[PDB]
């Protein structure tokens, strides 16, 4: 399995299982706002199945972060006459193996599991990302759950009354704390209080940022517990939610998903080996192919009016560009005949969405533009000249 470049995606279009795991690569990229590599270093055993173990440099507290399997889902019933919900039979599995990990646990730990949660009764889809934080102290024999919600605090222009919070549930805490209470039934841990952190003030029925926020909130909990800081989010030690999830936090997310291509092998190794996966050239070539296929399907991006570039105009360019870099990647020259063709298309390749794709790779291939990139490989020998 591979995570391809999705040239269309933007932070509004939603966050799923796979994409979330791609962003796991940014933790150890130093050029990205999500860098954890000062805070923690990977833990040698990975004792926890389906999770990434880390040692905190400052704290020497262990923190384990679950790779997204979605298939980690908690439905709730919004009608309060009915069941509290279900937890998906794997998310209950992992809850129990967390309990079982802490049976053996020498040093304090914090467990970071991203998941989705949904109303079952509502006919609408309404699929909404959150993040569950389970912290365990070996001296207390206590596990305190928390879950961090982007939709967050209720406006009191819209707020369920203490009567109707009896007839309706806004959220899944009921079913989830049964499952966590049920997971530790066996052992001698007392369960601390289940707390829900609501942040980002007011959001929708549900919205698609709620994942990109959740992924950020992964970064702040892993830093906070690594150092010994209390975890801060919007409304507590943060002001509005564009200082928390900043204009940079969004650039590296959207770019890693849009222009980037990764085997799942590589993010296992990037998280296991503490390293960073440097952008290679093949990624560029596939990200142009997946612009070429997507654009060929009639694209409404700047289509209607003031069109300077047609679809055939762009596609002719993406194909020629690609043709170059394949030759360069077979470690070949470029006839000046082809460098000729290219520099005529170079105004097209930098236009609108194509541009930031070509922009993304040229900064990450080190070259200042296409020429300074392709030029060192061109062959004029010996005419003309």
UniProtKB/Swiss-Prot annotation:
Q: Name one GO cellular component term.
A: host cell cytoplasmic vesicle membrane
Return the annotated region ranges for Catalytic region: 1-277
Q: Which residue positions are annotated as catalytic?
A: 128, 149, 210
Q: What is the effect of changing residue 160 to D?
A: Reduced ability to cleave lipid-conjugated ATG8 family proteins
Q: Where is this region: Membrane targeting region?
A: 278-383
Task: Print the keywords alphabetically.
Answer: Host cytoplasmic vesicle, Host membrane, Hydrolase, Membrane, Protease, Secreted, Thiol protease, Virulence
> One biological-process term from Gene Ontology?
proteolysis
Q: Positions of the region Alpha-3 helix?
A: 163-169
Its principal location? Answer: secreted
Q: Does the keyword Protease apply?
A: yes
Q: Where in the cell is it found?
A: Secreted; Host cytoplasmic vesicle membrane
Q: What is its EC number?
A: 3.4.22.-
Q: What catalytic reaction does the record list? A: [protein]-C-terminal L-amino acid-glycyl-phosphatidylethanolamide + H2O = a 1,2-diacyl-sn-glycero-3-phosphoethanolamine-N-glycine + [protein]-C-terminal <stereo>L-</stereo>amino acid; [protein]-C-terminal L-amino acid-glycyl-phosphatidylserine + H2O = 1,2-diacyl-sn-glycero-3-phospho-L-serine-N-glycine + [protein]-C-terminal <stereo>L-</stereo>amino acid
- Impact of altering residue 163 to D? Reduced ability to cleave lipid-conjugated ATG8 family proteins
GO MF annotation, one: cysteine-type peptidase activity
Q: What does this protein do?
A: Cysteine protease effector that inhibits host cell autophagy by targeting lipid-conjugated ATG8 family proteins on pre-autophagosomal structures. Specifically hydrolyzes the amide bond between the C-terminal glycine residue and an adjacent aromatic residue in ATG8 proteins conjugated to phosphatidylethanolamine (PE), producing an ATG8 protein that cannot be reconjugated by host ATG7 and ATG3. Mechanistically, Ravz interacts with ATG8 proteins conjugated to PE via its LIR motifs, extracts them from the membrane of autophagosomes and integrates the PE part into its own lipid-binding site.
Q: What is known of its domains?
A: The LIR motifs (LC3-interacting regions) are required for the interaction with ATG8 family proteins. The LIR motifs 1 and 2 at the N-terminus bind one ATG8 protein and the LIR motif 3 at the C-terminus binds another ATG8 protein. Among ATG8 proteins, the LIR motif 3 has preference for host GABARAP (GABARAP GABARAPL1, GABARAPL2) compared to LC3 (MAP1LC3A, MAP1LC3B, MAP1LC3C). The membrane targeting (MT) region binds phosphatidylinositol 3-monophosphate (PI3P). The MT region, together with the alpha-3 helix promote localization to high-curvature membranes, intimating localization to highly curved domains in autophagosome intermediate membranes. The alpha-3 helix is involved in extraction of the phosphatidylethanolamine (PE) moiety and docking of the acyl chains into the lipid-binding site.
What is the name of the protein in this document?
Cysteine protease RavZ
Organism encoding this protein = Legionella pneumophila subsp. pneumophila (strain Philadelphia 1 / ATCC 33152 / DSM 7513)
Full protein stretch here: 49 to 433 of 502
